[PDB]
Amino acid sequence: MSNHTYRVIEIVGTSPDGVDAAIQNGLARAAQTMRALDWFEVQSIRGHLTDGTVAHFQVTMKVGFRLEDSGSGHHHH
Amino acid sequence: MSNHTYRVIEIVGTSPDGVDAAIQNGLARAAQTMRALDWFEVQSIRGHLTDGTVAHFQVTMKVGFRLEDSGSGHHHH
Amino acid sequence: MSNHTYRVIEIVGTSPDGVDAAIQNGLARAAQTMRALDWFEVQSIRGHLTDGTVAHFQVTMKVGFRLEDSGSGHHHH
Amino acid sequence: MSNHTYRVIEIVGTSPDGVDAAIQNGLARAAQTMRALDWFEVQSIRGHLTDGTVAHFQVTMKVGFRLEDSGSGHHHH
Amino acid sequence: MSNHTYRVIEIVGTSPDGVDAAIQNGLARAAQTMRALDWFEVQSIRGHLTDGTVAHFQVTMKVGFRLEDSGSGHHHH
Amino acid sequence: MSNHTYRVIEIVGTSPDGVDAAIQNGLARAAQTMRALDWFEVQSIRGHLTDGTVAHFQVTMKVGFRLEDSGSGHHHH
Amino acid sequence: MSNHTYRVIEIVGTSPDGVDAAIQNGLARAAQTMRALDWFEVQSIRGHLTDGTVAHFQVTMKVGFRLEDSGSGHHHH
Amino acid sequence: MSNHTYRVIEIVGTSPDGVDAAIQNGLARAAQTMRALDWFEVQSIRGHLTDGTVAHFQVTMKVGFRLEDSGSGHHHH
Amino acid sequence: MSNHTYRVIEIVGTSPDGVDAAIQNGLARAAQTMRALDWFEVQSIRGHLTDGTVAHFQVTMKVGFRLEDSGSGHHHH
Amino acid sequence: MSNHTYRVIEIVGTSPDGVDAAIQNGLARAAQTMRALDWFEVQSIRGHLTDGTVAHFQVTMKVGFRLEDSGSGHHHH
Amino acid sequence: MSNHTYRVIEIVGTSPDGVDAAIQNGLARAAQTMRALDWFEVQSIRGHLTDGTVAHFQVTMKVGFRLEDSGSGHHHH
Amino acid sequence: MSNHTYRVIEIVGTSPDGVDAAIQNGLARAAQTMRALDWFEVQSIRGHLTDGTVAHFQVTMKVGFRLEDSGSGHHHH
Numbered sequence: 001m002s003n004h005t006y007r008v009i010e011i012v013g014t015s016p017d018g019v020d021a022a023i024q025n026g027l028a029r030a031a032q033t034m035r036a037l038d039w040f041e042v043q044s045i046r047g048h049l050t051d052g053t054v055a056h057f058q059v060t061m062k063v064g065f066r067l068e069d070s071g072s073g074h075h076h077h
Numbered sequence: 078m079s080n081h082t083y084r085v086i087e088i089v090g091t092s093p094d095g096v097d098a099a100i101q102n103g104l105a106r107a108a109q110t111m112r113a114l115d116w117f118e119v120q121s122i123r124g125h126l127t128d129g130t131v132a133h134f135q136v137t138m139k140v141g142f143r144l145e146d147s148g149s150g151h152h153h154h
Numbered sequence: 155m156s157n158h159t160y161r162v163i164e165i166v167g168t169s170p171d172g173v174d175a176a177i178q179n180g181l182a183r184a185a186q187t188m189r190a191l192d193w194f195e196v197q198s199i200r201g202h203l204t205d206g207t208v209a210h211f212q213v214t215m216k217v218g219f220r221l222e223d224s225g226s227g228h229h230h231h
Numbered sequence: 232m233s234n235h236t237y238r239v240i241e242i243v244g245t246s247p248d249g250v251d252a253a254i255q256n257g258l259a260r261a262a263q264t265m266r267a268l269d270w271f272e273v274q275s276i277r278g279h280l281t282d283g284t285v286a287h288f289q290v291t292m293k294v295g296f297r298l299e300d301s302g303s304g305h306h307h308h
Numbered sequence: 309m310s311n312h313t314y315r316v317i318e319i320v321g322t323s324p325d326g327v328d329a330a331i332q333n334g335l336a337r338a339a340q341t342m343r344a345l346d347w348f349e350v351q352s353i354r355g356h357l358t359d360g361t362v363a364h365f366q367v368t369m370k371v372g373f374r375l376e377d378s379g380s381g382h383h384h385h
Numbered sequence: 386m387s388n389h390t391y392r393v394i395e396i397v398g399t400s401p402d403g404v405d406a407a408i409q410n411g412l413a414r415a416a417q418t419m420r421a422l423d424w425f426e427v428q429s430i431r432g433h434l435t436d437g438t439v440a441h442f443q444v445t446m447k448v449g450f451r452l453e454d455s456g457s458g459h460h461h462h
Numbered sequence: 463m464s465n466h467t468y469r470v471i472e473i474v475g476t477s478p479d480g481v482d483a484a485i486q487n488g489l490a491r492a493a494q495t496m497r498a499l500d501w502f503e504v505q506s507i508r509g510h511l512t513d514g515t516v517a518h519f520q521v522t523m524k525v526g527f528r529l530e531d532s533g534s535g536h537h538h539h
Numbered sequence: 540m541s542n543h544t545y546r547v548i549e550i551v552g553t554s555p556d557g558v559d560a561a562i563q564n565g566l567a568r569a570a571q572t573m574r575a576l577d578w579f580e581v582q583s584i585r586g587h588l589t590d591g592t593v594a595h596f597q598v599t600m601k602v603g604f605r606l607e608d609s610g611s612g613h614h615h616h
Numbered sequence: 617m618s619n620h621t622y623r624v625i626e627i628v629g630t631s632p633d634g635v636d637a638a639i640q641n642g643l644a645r646a647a648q649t650m651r652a653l654d655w656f657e658v659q660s661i662r663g664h665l666t667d668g669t670v671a672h673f674q675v676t677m678k679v680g681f682r683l684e685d686s687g688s689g690h691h692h693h
Numbered sequence: 694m695s696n697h698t699y700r701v702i703e704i705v706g707t708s709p710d711g712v713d714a715a716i717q718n719g720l721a722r723a724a725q726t727m728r729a730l731d732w733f734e735v736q737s738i739r740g741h742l743t744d745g746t747v748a749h750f751q752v753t754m755k756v757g758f759r760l761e762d763s764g765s766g767h768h769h770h
Numbered sequence: 771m772s773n774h775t776y777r778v779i780e781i782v783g784t785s786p787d788g789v790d791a792a793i794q795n796g797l798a799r800a801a802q803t804m805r806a807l808d809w810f811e812v813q814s815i816r817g818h819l820t821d822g823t824v825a826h827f828q829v830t831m832k833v834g835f836r837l838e839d840s841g842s843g844h845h846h847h
Numbered sequence: 848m849s850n851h852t853y854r855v856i857e858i859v860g861t862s863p864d865g866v867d868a869a870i871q872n873g874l875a876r877a878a879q880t881m882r883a884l885d886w887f888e889v890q891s892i893r894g895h896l897t898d899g900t901v902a903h904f905q906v907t908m909k910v911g912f913r914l915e916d917s918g919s920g921h922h923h924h
Contacts, residue, residue, distance in 0.1 A: 317623065318623070318624040318682065319623050319683075320621065320622040320623075321621050322619070324618065324620075324693035325693045326645075337619070337621045338621070357622040359691070364617055
């Protein structure tokens with residue numbers, strides 16, 4: 001925890017069944033390929049209405065993962 | 078799609094059962110009277126607590142609909 | 155209060171005598187023609203200076219009114 | 232200019248040929264039907280890429296027009 | 309309603325089951341100890357992912373309650 | 386002034402007679418019970434319209450007061 | 463009006479008697495020395511409380527004035 | 540369209556000939572190497588002035604592309 | 617970690633020797649009296665210049681602490 | 694480059710022929726009288742519509758120039 | 771303190787040795803030529819990396835100074 | 848410099864010894880693996896307090912690097 005450095009990527013998750021779906025739907029695919037999803041932050045909740053009655057919630061989130069080598073989980077000052 | 082122009086209105090949807098409710102509750106009434114709801118954007122999630130334990134989620138959204146005559150769905154450059 | 159949906163419009167009120175004037179001057183005209191002004195939110199206080207010494211305060215506000223049919227003032231969850 | 236009150240609407244103009252196009256393309260249709268477009272403010276410049284190489288610039292703007300009766304263009308304080 | 313003054317506090321509610329949970333989970337504890345929760349406003353929806361698949365939604369909200377003595381619910385101008 | 390630390394609270398003041406009223410109406414009650422109001426910052430000017438013609442300006446402000454013991458009013462670097 | 467270019471300066475006006483005072487108090491001194499104050503925009507309304515009961519409203523505004531030579535008031539496209 | 544998840548990257552495009560150039564200049568290189576640029580959003584228009592008279596417009600944009608496998612273009616609720 | 621709810625307070629720390637000082641100077645006093653400072657967020661770095669050459673950095677931060685009873689550090693969904 | 698200090702001024706450029714015009718029209722006049730325009734940042738794109746069909750794009754930008762004496766272009770740490 | 775009016779200028783300070791350096795490096799040059807620097811506000815902390823390992827922190831700040839004649843330090847309402 | 852296009856990534860640097868540490872700690876690891884870090888922008892300064900007295904400053908920054916082939920450093924308009 002001395003020089004742990006993280007990276008934040010932004011992904012947009014989409015689900016016709018809610019915001020908690022899109023959050024989980026997108027966060028999930030992200031992990032299918034990335035390392036250590038540690039946190040997320042929602043930046044927008046938007047959406048499209050197809051057929052006028054089918055919303056496809058589109059939630060944009062910023063997700064953060066550790067890139068630095070698993071190193072000493074320490075405090076050094 | 079050459080000169081399609083849209084209009085954005087802002088509506089606040091309210092539901093005691095969630096944010097996805099208010100979004101759908103309000104978006105829905107909006108369509109009862111407007112043309113071609115194409116998209117929406119959430120701007121705020123607020124709420125009132127009546128009886129101290131009854132939240133009435135109030136979600137404000139900006140909704141967008143086409144005003145321009147259905148015209149050539151085209152690309153011209 | 156179960157599915158009450160509101161609409162927010164934005165108007166700019168102007169008065170040479172203050173911000174509370176423009177707020178009331180504009181909000182007032184808005185009601186001359188709209189239904190149930192319930193709330194307002196100020197977004198900007200700007201102004202022009204004519205003759206260099208005559209400010210015309212221009213206050214932009216977002217005003218909200220009920221569109222949904224007067225329905226049950228109720229809580230349903 | 233004592234109690235002149237204005238209204239601001241938001242429209243999204245779109246053009247495959249630029250931002251100044253979409254601004255003018257949308258502002259123009261707006262006037263086809265509204266009164267006294269006096270000003271505009273850009274809020275976003277976004278866009279879609281169809282065929283991957285055809286951008287359709289979408290510029291969202293807030294446009295303002297006078298609603299109050301043409302009245303004394305005056306200063307009263 | 310003449311000199312009613314309110315106070316706004318900020319709390320972060322957390323739930324592994326959604327945003328509407330955290331909102332209600334946190335708002336609720338807040339009332340366990342405070343007076344007259346009247347309104348709330350969401351400011352952020354964030355979260356941590358433990359085990360990589362267990363999100364703990366963290367919603368930050370600003371909650372508002374009346375401090376001024378229950379006084380005349382009146383309008384005085 | 387070396388380690389003087391302050392605290393900022395947020396209060397909403399309300400008055401049917403203006404924004405300068407609500408600011409003073411709320412700031413005042415705040416002092417009835419707190420120590421050393423030193424500054425304030427307005428964050429929003431909102432309002433409700435009862436009877437459609439009775440605005441109750443609601444101004445939200447952040448107020449700051451000293452918590453640290455009255456200590457040396459000094460500069461140390 | 464073809465190449466009229468303006469400059470915006472920021473000034474903070476202060477008055478113990480209100481926001482409309484500080485706006486006018488500051489805007490005024492600004493003109494004592496500058497050319498053609500044409501517009502202003504409020505950016506903050508803050509304040510200090512001396513004696514705990516004497517607010518000195520401090521309003522920060524951005525003021526705009528013409529620098530370009532009085533030239534053709536024209537439209538050229 | 541049920542679980543389509545997207546990724547947003549941010550790129551800065553630069554052109555001495557305009558903002559629509561930099562937008563297209565940068566968006567273009569981005570596609571030279573990425574999949575399915577679907578949308579873009581401008582976040583800043585900045586620039587450097589070399590030789591004092593050569594602006595190099597620098598437009599920062601957020602571009603979004605699909606990462607999820609081309610899957611059912613469907614609505615499922 | 618199922619219903620852990622937190623509270624965020626805002627404090628301004630001040631030090632003539634830097635921003636990391638004010639952050640630590642203020643955060644520290646805050647703990648002298650509060651429970652479980654878990655996190656902080658900087659919102660502003662401002663300052664006053666006394667004697668014209670003595671800056672007193674004033675850093676405003678939002679600090680967050682747990683209020684809910686130490687309860688099961690668990691995940692429940 | 695050790696103690697190079699810059700100053701940022703804000704100017705509004707205007708042109709009936711576009712945003713890239715106003716940017717260049719205004720930036721240009723600014724240099725007619727200032728030293729070393731090094732960079733610019735757009736803050737707003739607004740405009741007035743005279744005759745309803747003559748937009749006068751008004752672009753506000755923040756421009757930055759060096760004030761410190763041309764000194765060692767160096768790195769010192 | 772009745773009609774004291776201030777002016778805010780924006781300067782960018784730069785130092786290879788930190789943010790507190792650039793703040794002091796720039797604020798300092800500003801005073802070499804201006805009157806009564808009373809306060810400052812940081813707006814951005816940016817930077818360039820020359821040689822890839824030499825950061826030149828660039829901190830932009832808004833600095834405020836009194837322009838109005840030293841007048842009665844008084845409260846008048 | 849005609850079509851140089853850049854990419855901006857966001858990383859969070861962490862150090863128990865300051866903000867200038869985390870900035871340098873994170874920026875550094877980023878370069879260990881990326882090309883041409885040219886600039887950075889701070890977006891947040893946050894932090895965790897372990898043991899209540901060990902802050903781990905977490906600074907989030909946006910870093911920008913060139914992706915386009917080293918090409919003509921030129922101006923072409």
